[model samples]
Target: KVRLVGGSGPHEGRVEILHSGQWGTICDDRWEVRVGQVVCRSLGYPGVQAVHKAAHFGQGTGPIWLNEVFCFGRESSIEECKIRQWGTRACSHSEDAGVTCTL
Candidate 1:
């Protein structure tokens, strides 16, 4: 199962997730309402329920597993969100963000 990590801030911040025991960052690189739509659907939400960022949930305590994830907003799972094997990131693992979905 996928789980969100590091989120202790407010809206429009950032968030991350754990997939297959590996952690990844949710890229706001091209983040848009469309991307939010995909995430909502993937989580089984009827539609784009809600899109939030900025460690709103809290913060993590490790290396920022992911940096910039590329999502076409159309995938079967969040794992499918386009991502880079390794890249540079301005935020630290503690700054990891969070996201939520509903039905």
Candidate 2:
């Protein structure tokens, strides 16, 4: 599962994912608009307006679940995108990824 967090509004924020019963953040490594598109769609948004990196919303805790994510805009969820192994990352919380949706 995925959710947006720490935004001024519901349509924008840091991207967090749930894996192995733990909620974690995604690293900014290779983050892109197509990845954001998949995130928005899974959250029921029609599309994304912008993609962010370097902890655009704010730093996150727990595990950093994903890195080097890639997507093609047709994924139903962020997990459908290519990614590094869960909780395996070469990044800090300050490198978290985020997005802003069309609402």
Candidate 3:
């Protein structure tokens, strides 16, 4: 499962799940609703409960990066987003990424 840290506002955090290990950071440079949608779907969320932004959570402590994250909400897996590309971040790996799932 994935998790988030803590920050303030308009500066959220996020991470990805891979090979029994969680790694990755959302691109603060172009973080948008569309991207959040992709993330929600990627994590098997019924839908986006809330696209929170801010250090309200903490922050990531790894490579703040991104790849071509194209989620259609029906891909069946988040690995599909890996087909795109990965970018870099300026945060730590310990920073948390704020995310809410639907019930």
Lowest lDDT block of 10, candidate 2: 80-89
TM-score for each model: 0.59, 0.94, 0.54
Clash tally for model 2: 0
Worst 10 residues of 1 by lDDT: 4-13
Residue-level lDDT of model 2, residues 2-100, one tens digit each, is 899999888999999999999999888878888889999999999999999999899999999988777899899978877656786599999999999
**Cα-based lDDT at residue 99, candidate 3:** 57
Instruction: Quote the lDDT for 43 in model 1.
Output: 56
Give the clashing residue pairs of candidate 2, or none. Answer: none
Q: Assess each prediction's global lDDT (C-alpha) against the native.
A: 0.53, 0.90, 0.48
Best candidate according to TM-score: 2
The true-versus-predicted C-alpha distance at residue 43 of model 1, in Å, is 2.4
Q: Per-residue CA lDDT of candidate 1, range 1-103, in tens?
A: 3444432322222444565466556533344555566556665665554555545555555445555656677776656777666434666544444555544
Candidate 2 residue 36 Cα shift, in angstroms, is: 0.4
lDDT of 3 at 74: 49
List the candidate numbers ranked by lDDT, top first: 2, 1, 3
Tens digits of lDDT, candidate 3, 1-103? 3444442322223544443244655544444455565566655565556655443354554455553455545454455544455544444434334555453
Backbone clash count, each prediction separately: 16, 0, 35
Query: Which scores better on lDDT, 2 or 3?
Result: 2
Error of 3 at 97 (Å): 5.4
